[PDB]
Amino acid sequence: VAEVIAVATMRCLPGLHPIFKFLIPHIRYTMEINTRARTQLISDGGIFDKAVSTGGGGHVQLLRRAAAQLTYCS
Amino acid sequence: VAEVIAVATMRCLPGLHPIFKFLIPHIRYTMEINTRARTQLISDGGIFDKAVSTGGGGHVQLLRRAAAQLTYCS
Numbered sequence: 001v002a003e004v005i006a007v008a009t010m011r012c013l014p015g016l017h018p019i020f021k022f023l024i025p026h027i028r029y030t031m032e033i034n035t036r037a038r039t040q041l042i043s044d045g046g047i048f049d050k051a052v053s054t055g056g057g058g059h060v061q062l063l064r065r066a067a068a069q070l071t072y073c074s
Numbered sequence: 075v076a077e078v079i080a081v082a083t084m085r086c087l088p089g090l091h092p093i094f095k096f097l098i099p100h101i102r103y104t105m106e107i108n109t110r111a112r113t114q115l116i117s118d119g120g121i122f123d124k125a126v127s128t129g130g131g132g133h134v135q136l137l138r139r140a141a142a143q144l145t146y147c148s
Contacts, residue, residue: 045119045130056119 001070006030075144080104 006027013020042048042059049055054062080101087094115121116133123129128136 045123049119 002027002030003034076101076104077108 005023009020009023009027013023015021040046044057046055048059052059079097083094083097083101087097089095113120117123118131120129122133126133
């Protein structure tokens with residue numbers, strides 16, 4: 001969710017915008033740690049696939065079901 | 075090739091058959107060693123995928139190409 005907040009803040013809020021200046025400390029390092037998770041942790045054959053029971057593709061299917069339950073109220 | 079020989083020898087050559095008695099020492103442990111290979115070594119996410127450059131699916135295509143080149147004379 002924060003990466004979605006991070007990318008959209010960069011893409012659509014310029015440096016003069018007050019909402020950008022509000023949110024730019026709160027999106028620090030979010031894109032890299034999500035990239036590092038997608039590269040090392042939750043990748044196919046990553047660290048999640050060596051210990052967690054939802055690894056090996058089941059966590060992706062769990063992420064799809066969770067995204068359907070990802071409501072704004074939650 | 076040894077696994078194919080082993081399985082065909084077990085399926086088609088009974089214990090009475092001389093060619094079975096001839097080939098049974100030469101097919102010992104082949105099925106288990108290949109099963110362990112297909113479980114731990116050449117499987118998706120296996121040791122091959124963790125170190126070797128053809129791992130992760132390329133080795134299967136390479137195996138298909140080699141099987142096309144797997145001639146009797148070779």
